[PDB]
């Protein structure tokens, strides 16, 4: 795919600083859907406010993990048979921690938000569309984990 290069080129900008950019993604996510905050239960404690998650090493590690999985998707943008089974398993894991599959739409919007804000004018409509397609494919693989 040649929309694979829009993804690779737009990801290089953000992939150099995964935590900063993933923080934008999660800040956006909780602004859009505050009910996701309690799903991050580290040491059986709930974050009261979004900003509390940003002081949590475990939550920031989760942002790193998310950026690593997105980086794997970018690396395999032509692929996604390398990752199908891993994503399913990642879906099952999220289902288990209580994430509703529908929340991954908000995540998608957060990721697109974050890429728009990082790329400015370089986040063309084509780049947007490419990412929506890639993210959609990632979620489709993960959705198998909600065993449907
Ligand atoms: C609504 C959005 C999400 C929520 C509420 C969420 C929540 C969680 C929680 C609570 C865990 C277990 C604790 C931890 O490892 O920190 C987890 C694991 C993980 N999440 Fe997320 N997550 C979300 C989205 C994502 C997305 C979109 C990705 C990937 C692009 C992702 C990648 C990971 C990874 C890599 C793990 C470790 C899975 C394992 O090996 O056990 N998460 N998530």
Curated annotation (Swiss-Prot):
It comes from the Eukaryota. Monomeric globin with a bis-histidyl six-coordinate heme-iron atom through which it can bind dioxygen, carbon monoxide and nitric oxide. Could help transport oxygen and increase its availability to the metabolically active neuronal tissues, though its low quantity in tissues as well as its high affinity for dioxygen, which may limit its oxygen-releasing ability, argue against it. The ferrous/deoxygenated form exhibits a nitrite reductase activity and it could produce nitric oxide which in turn inhibits cellular respiration in response to hypoxia. Heme b binds at residues 62, 94. Induction: Up-regulated upon oxygen-glucose deprivation. Pfam families: Globin. It catalyses: Fe(III)-heme b-[protein] + nitric oxide + H2O = Fe(II)-heme b-[protein] + nitrite + 2 H(+). GO terms for molecular function: GDP-dissociation inhibitor activity; heme binding; metal ion binding; nitrite reductase activity; oxygen binding; oxygen carrier activity. Phosphorylated during hypoxia by ERK1/ERK2. Phosphorylation regulates the heme pocket hexacoordination preventing the association of His-62 with the heme metal center. Thereby, promotes the access of dioxygen and nitrite to the heme and stimulates the nitrite reductase activity. Phosphorylation during hypoxia is stabilized by 14-3-3 proteins. This is Neuroglobin. GO terms for cellular component: cytosol; mitochondrial matrix. Residues 1-147 form the Globin domain. Its EC number is 1.7.-.-. Gene3D superfamilies: Globins (1.10.490.10). It is found in: Cytoplasm, Cytosol; Mitochondrion matrix. It comes from Mus musculus. Belongs to the globin family. InterPro entries: Globin (IPR000971), Globin-like_OT (IPR050532), Globin-like_sf (IPR009050), Globin/Proto (IPR012292). PROSITE patterns: GLOBIN. Predominantly expressed in brain. One of its GO terms (biological process) is cellular response to hypoxia.
